[PDB]
Symmetry: none
Subunit: 32 residues, 10 copies
């Protein structure tokens, strides 16, 4: 029995949920 | 019995849920 | 018995659910 | 018995459900 | 029985949740 | 013009895709 | 023009994709 | 123009992707 | 123009991705 | 123009990614 782990380039570029842009705001952007 | 793991380029570019753009806002953007 | 895992380019470009664009907003965008 | 996994380019470009565009909004966009 | 771990380039470039841009703000940006 | 949102019990009990059960495994389970 | 948001019980009990059960494993479980 | 936000019980009980159970392991569990 | 935010019980009980249980391990558990 | 923020009970009980349980370990637990 042996246990060798070789994980390369694990990535989660997560940008998931709610974004609140509300009032009187003409926005050139992209909010997380 | 052996256990070798070789995972390359695991990725979840998640941008999932609710986006709130509400009122009086002409927005050139893309909110997460 | 052996266990070798070689996973390459796992990806879920998830952008799934509800998007709330509400009132008085002429929006050139694409909200997540 | 052996277990070799070689998965390449797993992808789910999911953009599934409800999109809420409500009132007084002439929108050039595509909301998730 | 042996336990060798060789993990390379573990990464989570997480920028997940709520972003609050509220009022009278024409913003060229991208807030986390 | 008004914008009132009253959403109750939004749900997506998603368990969608590929399930990999491979070899020499009599499994009493249900894998996501 | 007004913007009132009253969202209650937003939920996504997501358990979506690939599950890897490979070899010589009689498993009473349910892996995400 | 007004911007009032009243969001209650925002939830994403996400447990989404790959689960790796590999070899010689009779497991009573449920791994994320 | 006004900007009032009243957000209650924002929650993401996220337990998303890869779980590595490898070899010679009969495990009563649930690993994140 | 006014900016009032009243956020109550902001929470992200995040326990997301990789969990490494490897070899010769019968574990009653739940590792983050």
């Amino acid at each position: 029995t042996c246990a060798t782990q070789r994980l390369a380039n694990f990535l989660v570029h997560s940008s998931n949920n709610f974004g609140a842009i509300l009032s009187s705001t003409n926005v050139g952007s992209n909010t997380y």
